[PDB]
Structure 1
Amino acid sequence: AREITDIKQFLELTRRADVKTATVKINKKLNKAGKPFRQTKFKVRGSSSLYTLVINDAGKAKKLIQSLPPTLKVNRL
């Protein structure tokens, strides 16, 4: 399993030919041992490796969910 940090790279991975499925996972975590916050992991299932992009911003995560390609099969929660 690999972790990706570039958003353009993540979009290219979602549009890659062998890619069919993605998973959206929601975690409840603590930032600097403070208030609770929401973390979103996008997991693209490639042929050889599984790619994970971690976003700590709920609004950016919602925008990325909206920007996901429509033919990609997304498994939420």
Structure 2
Amino acid sequence: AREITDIKQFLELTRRADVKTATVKINKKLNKAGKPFRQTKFKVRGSSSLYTLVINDAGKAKKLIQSLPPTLKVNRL
């Protein structure tokens, strides 16, 4: 399993003609000081690797789930 940090590469990867399935995981964490935030993980299945992107902001994850390609299968949880 690999990991990507830049979002353009993630979107590009969701459109590699070989990815079929993705998964959206929700993790209730805490930011080491006082507050529980809702970290989100996007996991795209390749054919020899599995790629992952981690977002802490909720709005960015909403925009991701919005602009995901409308041809890819997505397992919520």
Using the size of structure 1 for normalisation, the TM-score is: 0.97
Structure 2: distance between partners of 1:62 and 1:20? 21
**How do 1:30-45 and structure 2 match up within 5 A?**
30-45=30-45
Query: How well do the aligned residues superpose, as a CA RMSD in angstroms?
Result: 0.6
Q: What per-residue deviation string (whole Å, max 9, x for no partner) do you get for residues 19-54 of structure 1?
A: 100000000000023110000000000000000000
* Runs of 5+ consecutive residues of structure 1 not aligned to the other structure: none
**1:17: how far off?**
1.1
Structure 2: distance between partners of 1:34 and 1:28? 13
Q: Which runs of 4+ in 1 moved over 3 A?
A: none
Structure 2: distance between partners of 1:2 and 1:33? 29
Percent sequence identity is 100
Structure 1: distance between partners of 2:59 and 2:8? 18
